[model samples]
Structure formats: structure tokens, C-alpha cells
Target: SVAADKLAKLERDFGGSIGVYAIDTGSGATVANRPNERFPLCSSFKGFLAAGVLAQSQDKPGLLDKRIRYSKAALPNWSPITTKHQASGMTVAELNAASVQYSDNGAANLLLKEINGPAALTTFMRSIGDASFRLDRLEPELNSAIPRDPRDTSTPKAVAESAQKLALGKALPEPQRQQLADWLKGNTTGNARIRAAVPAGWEVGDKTGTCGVYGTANDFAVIWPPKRAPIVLAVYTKHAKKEAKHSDEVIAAAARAALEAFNVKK
Candidate 1:
């Protein structure tokens, strides 16, 4: 069995909550640490939102091509693109890149409007056998919540399972898959967590989310090892929003322990 002590210790050290899930795709080797526990997904929720958009576009061709003009509603505190003086508009596909790769809150919520609402995102995930996951609100709304809304959340197990499904090409067509893959390939945020813990030569594709004022740091990844099949991982840590440095280290430490234990479980 995977060492649960290390996982628990990391959480206790930070005096925060940490959840982890690791699954070997081929061998069915799996580890779940506080797997069912819900954690505010923060920007990591963008992973599912992106997938939901792709699934919707597949059903309605050209949906991804729709243009969104970045204006007041598209601007958020973390916007890297929309706030640019030269920025005016980008296609749904490009917005997804900003949403996931840049963790651009503005682009994600703008795209969320195009999909209609949380009901659409909820239906999309349920279509893929994911019913327990929640799609409660858009990006700005999530960050503005006083108590950290309960509806915009997911468990580590759900996140890891979704990563595994996306990795296996389970619900997406070729074009849609490519669009999603393009962003995951350029993911710049997760290097310190899951990517930092994996073995050398392992290729990891992931989406990272951090709500510094909302108290969450998350990374969900599909890791492809040179000698073993892909492994899906999700790590989340939560506490005071201002305590990001501490929680970030907590997540990195927990991910290291979880990924290391996969070898033990293997």
C-alpha cells in the first residue's frame, strides 16, 4: 500500500487540507489520499471547463471558432491577455489556452458565458460519467465568494479520474483533443508540483490553478513515464489565501510523497 503517513504529515505540517490521487493507467495501480474529500478547485476547475467547452463544440461544429471581444466583462484580476492594450478578441480555442495555460480568470469566465452556464458544464461532465463533480460558478464569482462557495469544488479522485479519461482520449474527437492538448502542452503553472515530483524523462501534461486570495493551490496531471504507462495525479492544498507560499510547498511535498508511493504500490 502507498504510505499514507507522509501524505497526512504534509497536511498536518501546514495545518491545512491536502488531497492526492495517483493512478497508473495500464497496470491499474492507484492511490487515493483523502481522495473523496472536496477541495475548492480554484483555477484547476478550468480543466473541466475547458473539456466541457470542447465536448460542446464537438456537438456543434464551429463552436470553438466563435470570437469573443475582450471588454469589461472579460477582464478579471488575473487576466494576462484581455487587459493588454492591443488585445481585442480571440477565438474560443485561444481563450481556453489563456484560461488553462495562463490561468487567466477573465478568459475562462468569458468562455463560460458562451457555453450558457454551470448547467451546461455540469451536463457535459455527467455525459462523461462524472456526476459528482460540481460546476457552481464562473471565475470572478468564484474568487469573490466570502466563504469560498461549496458548489465550485471537486475531490482529488474525481480530478484524477478526469485526467485519466482525457489522457486516454475517452470522450473527445481528434480535433477537440488537439485543441485541448495544445494548451496542456504549454501549461506553465504546474511545474512546481506534480511535474516537480515525477521521475526524469517523464512527460507531464496538466492544468494548474491558484486562488491566492481564495486559499487554494491545485495541479491535476496526466504523466507519461518512459518505462511505465501514464499516471494521473491530482494534488490540492487549502488554507488562508495569503498563506500561498506555505500551501504551495505543502502541495509540492504531498505530490512528491504520492508520486513516490506509486513505485511502492506498483
Candidate 2:
């Protein structure tokens, strides 16, 4: 088992507060730093949104493969997808990948709207065993007309458990599990968190989150077996007095420290 001392030391070295919770999927052994602390999901919430969509699709076959035309209205904020293409079309599967892989806010907002209105997304979160998670602050123009207060947040424990469920095919039925695995294979948010911790070429499925204000950044991930152990990790950080970019570096360094704690082998 890895030592908490290593993780703690890394947290200190990074010069920012960090919370990490990692558990072996097979054994359930955990390494943590303030494992129970809750923080906003930021964009990492997209993964949960993706899971909900897949769950919805599983309940209704062929729904994911149906193509939906992209429109300017589908995107409400600054986004890589909306900025580059005006009228691209994609299936739900593609949207899931775009939402998580690229961390495309437009795609995520669209998928959130498509799966269910913002209110319904909150309801779905509770249905999936996350009663406290909320999507109220997510802008209203994307789906609903009412703007609610932002309450989308998660603890390291909850994030890890969710990842473990997804990896173990427990988040949805068998077919949808395979769909998630396939979609996660294309995850491109590699410059942070889990991907940054392990060696190049290691297969990883993960998501990164960032917000320009409120001083938050996070990464949640699931690593496959035969390496250390199949584990879920969530690294969260907040910088009260620093810029968001600076906070990002702090979180990235903490992730590197976590990788070192596990002694990931190339």
C-alpha cells in the first residue's frame, strides 16, 4: 500500500491545499488527503452528465447513435466547439466524447440540456445516489429558462466511488458500460491530473475541471488494472488569493505528487 506521508508531502511542496481520495478497485484500500472535503465539480461535472446520458440511452436503445444537428443556440458560452464549427452534427456518443475529452463547455451544456432540463439533471443526480449534487447555477439559456443558484459540487469520496462504479460496470447496465469505456478511450484532457501522474502511453480515463473564478480546479480519474491497482482519484484545490491559472499549476503538481505516491511504473 502507498503511504499518506508521500501524498501529504506533495501537497506541501505544491504550496496549495489539496484533497485526494484513491481506492483500489479490487481491494478497496484507500490513500487520501482530506478525502471527505467537498468542492465544486467545475467542468468535471460533465463526466457525471455523460454517465446520465448513457444511462438514458441504455434505457432507450439506438438513442445514442441518433445524430443531432449542432446550432449556435446549442452553445451558450465561449467554447472550442462553437468557436470552430457552426453547424457540425454528431450522435450522442460523439457529444459525450466532445463534452469530456475536449472539456467542451458547449457540448457539455448541450448534452445536459438534451438528457434532461437542468432541474431534471439535479433529479437524476439524486437518482444515481448523489443527493446533494445540484446544477442550479448552470446557465439557464442552454435548456431551462429559470436560472438557479449553482450547487454542483462533489467530495473526493463520491467522485472516486462514481469512477469505481463506472469501471466495474455498475454505473449502468452492461451495454452502456461498454459504451462508456469506448467513449472514455478518446479522452483528450491529458495535460492534467491522472494522465499527468502516470507515464506516457498508460491507458487512462479521466476528466479535468476548471473555473476562472471562485478559485477551483479538479481532476477525477479511473486507472485500469495490472499496474498498481484499479483506482479512482479525485484531486481538488482552491486558491483564495491566486489566479485560476496559478491554481491549475497547484492542482497539476498535486496530481504529480499522487502519481509518485503510487509509484506508477512505465
Candidate 3:
């Protein structure tokens, strides 16, 4: 059984809602703290997009290898790639790297468009058994009404379930699963709350998200072959104001506390 006092301490210390779910792959024992709570996914939704692309690729082979011409239009205002690689054409794999690794808004939005708009992705989510997750419209008054913001939102459980399916290779065909794993390996957003709490080096794959402002931050990840135990973890948090320092601290602390309560390493 999970310890209530410990969880209460974490909430008090973090100053926000924290939801955690860890599943032991070997024993099937599960432990969680507010696992079903819904929180804004921020950019972590990219993981779902990545999985959707892989599933779509199964129906359309060679899609991952297809070359996409890069342009200012592909990225819009959310990617640093435009500034760095002005005219470089990359494959579907590269675009995914940009979207997940760097958490580039431009890369994600462009990829979302390529994957058949919001409707198609929503359909994909339902096909994968995530019926509760839905895309929320981004308020125009908040941040220029970017497509990324509108597409960016998810519940902690939905995020975790997506990763679980990917890890189990249940959503897409076997070959596509390996490809999706490789794509996730390139994710570079080291500021992710879940991964940050873990030790320096661990076979962990993750995706992180943050609003342009400070208060809203979200991260989701799965720890491969947990130390002395194999478990999948999904965690999330939301803040009302932009406070990167505080947000990061709160998330990191909550993650560490959760892991500790579960008797899991880092």
C-alpha cells in the first residue's frame, strides 16, 4: 500500500498538484499518487504525436524515411531549427527529433499538420484506448493562438498510458515500435522534471513540455528496467503563473519524493 503521509508531504512541499503512477513490469504491482488527475500536458503531447506517426507509418511504409523540405513555413515561430538550419531538408525522423528532443513548438505543430490535423490525431488517440484525452483550443488572448498551444494538453493517466502502450509495443506494429523508441531516444529537453529527478545516467526515455510563460510545465516519461525493479512512471504538474525556477523545483521534488515512497531508485 502507498503511504498517505509521504504523499501529503510531497504536495505540501511542491505547492501544486502532482500525479504519479508506477507499474512494475515484472510483478504487476502498482503504486500511485493521484494517478488519474488531469493536468495540462504542455509539449509532452508530442509523445502522442510521435506514437501516432509510427502507427500511421505501419499503414504507409517508408513514411519515416521520406524526406521533408524544411522551410520557415514548416516551423513558424516555435522552432530554433529555422534559425540554425535555414534550408536543410530532413527526414520524418529528423523532424521528430526536433519536435521531441528540443521541444520545438514549430517542429511539433508542423508534424501535427503532417499527421492529418487535430481531428486525425484525436482519432488516433481513441484508437489507442485514450478516450479521455482531448485537444483544447488555445486562447488567442494568451499567446497569439498558436496551433501548438491548442494541441497541447493531456491528463496524467492518458500520458502514462500512451507511454505504456509504446513500451509494450501494443499500439503500433513491432517494427514501428522500435522506430518510435529510437525517435524518443533523441529527445534533448533535459529540463524534464521526471528525468531530472533520476540519477545522472539511466536508460530513461522521456518528453517534456512548458508553456512560453513560466507557471505551466508538464513532463511524462517511462524508466526502462527500473533499478532492482521494472516499472513505468507517468507524472505531471501545473502552475498558475510563470516561475521556471519554482516550477522546476516543485516538479523535481515531487518526482523524487514519489520515487522514494515507492522504494525505487532515482
Candidate 4:
């Protein structure tokens, strides 16, 4: 497949590394590049955090509708929506929606608390059979993007596999799964990444991570193409330069390369 050349070219153009994994649920066709190598997860974990919350809701019942009130001091940087609702607070589902759809930092931190903590989120991943996912710190700190550090990192293969189960498989049951999809599909931050690469009119939902340093950033998605089974893909990137900025264009190009392996039309 031309996936290799396309990905390689983009890495060179990006002046950094690009990790990708894509699987066609219908045909089982696959494409990968450095799929096992670790990369900072950044804010990408919020989606799975939302999924874990949904998983908990299944057994706990009414967890989603439960309202949570947090102090003003708890708000983290980049919390656009949560800041406005600090006086009123928000429901568990609202927090999840804000966390996934807006990449709201405060919303994510609150949800992390709802699931017990970062370590518990890791446990949730393991329970779902994902051994590679990890979350060692809270927002801002987790986005450090320190060179080669593994504090909060996961592989493209690991994230894609997890998305396979949570998004397209039975990891969260039907209702919770759909809820997670709705949150991801509603995401406003991913328009420039994976969503940009996908064909127009296709149903695609994704979560994105931007570390804002060390060129670390990522996006993973579940895509629905008409007349096809669907494709689950993860694209992650990091540059060696400490000051390099993340590239949405490169991310989109890498995703396009992954889809090309299965002959998905642009």
C-alpha cells in the first residue's frame, strides 16, 4: 500500500514523527505506521474518560443526570464552557459533553474526579482489555509533553483498538456507546484534523489532543462511510524540536494516507 510513502512523506514534511492506525470494520483491512510507539496522549484521554463515565453509569444508574457543583478555584485553564457554568454547576452528562465536545479542561478534571482519578481511568482501560493506555497526571501537567517522557502516553494501535470496542464494539453497551458517540460527534475542536480528511457527508466523530509544546498532539476517530462497515483510526504526532507547533494539516494528511490503504475515496 502507498500508506508507507504517504506517511513517511508527511513525517518529513512535519519535521517530526507521525503514528497512525486505521481498521475497516467491514473488511478488516488495516494500515499502520509506528503504531506501537508511545506518544503523549494530551487531552485525547477525555473521550475515554467520558466513555468510562458512561460505563459507570450503566451499573450506577442515573449517574449521567447527577448534578455536580464545583468551587470557582477548581477551574483550570482553557475552560471556556465550564467557566460560564461555575455559578450553576453542571450535570455529569453535561461535564462529559463539555469535556469531549469542547475539550474543556475544567470539565475533564471534574470528570476525572467523577471516575475516582487518573489511575482509575487507566484501570477502566485495562478492564476493557487495553493494556497500553495510561493517565498519570491531571490537566495542564499532563500536557507537559516533555521529550520522550511516558507519564501520560499511549500508542496509536492501543487507542485505535480501544476506540474499536468503545465506539464500534460493545465496550459500553448500546445506549452508553451511542452517548459516547454523540459526545465525540459533537466535538468542536477536531474539525481541522481527522474530520477534515474524511469525505464530506460521511458520519465521523473524533476527539483531539493538543499539548501546545514539543509538537505533541493527536486525534482518534470512528468514521461511518455510506455502504461500508465503518473505520476506526488514530493519528498521533510529535516533533523533536521543543518549540515546534502541532500541525493540523499534517494530521489530516496522515489520516488521508491511512484511508488510502483501504482505497477509501476522498
Best by TM-score: 4
Local distance difference test values of all predictions, in order? 0.74, 0.67, 0.65, 0.92
Please write out the lDDT profile of model 2 over residues 74-137, one tens digit for every residue: 5667577644655657777777888888887777777877877666767776776765556655
Could you give candidate 1's per-residue lDDT for residues 55-101 as a string of tens digits? 88877888878877867653777788666632558888878887888
> Residue-pair clashes per candidate, as listed?
0, 2, 6, 0
Residue-wise lDDT of candidate 3 within 1-266, one digit each (tens)?
A: 34446656766765555666666566666657777665666677777778888877877888878877766654556678634665776677777888778876666666776787666777888888887566543222223213224344566667777787875546787887776776665667745577777766665677876655535566666666535554566666654445532366656765676566656645
User: Which regions of candidate 2 fall more than 4 Å away from where they truly are?
Assistant: 1-3, 6-16, 82-85, 139-150, 225-228, 242-244, 247-249, 259-266
Q: Model 1 reaches what TM-score against the true structure?
A: 0.89
How do these models rank on TM-score, best leading? 4, 1, 3, 2
Error of 4 at 201 (Å): 1.6
Q: Residue 183 in candidate 1 has what lDDT?
A: 72
Q: How close is every model to the real structure, measured as TM-score?
A: 0.89, 0.83, 0.84, 0.98
Residue 13 error for model 4, in Å? 1.8
- Please report the candidate that would top lDDT against the real structure: 4
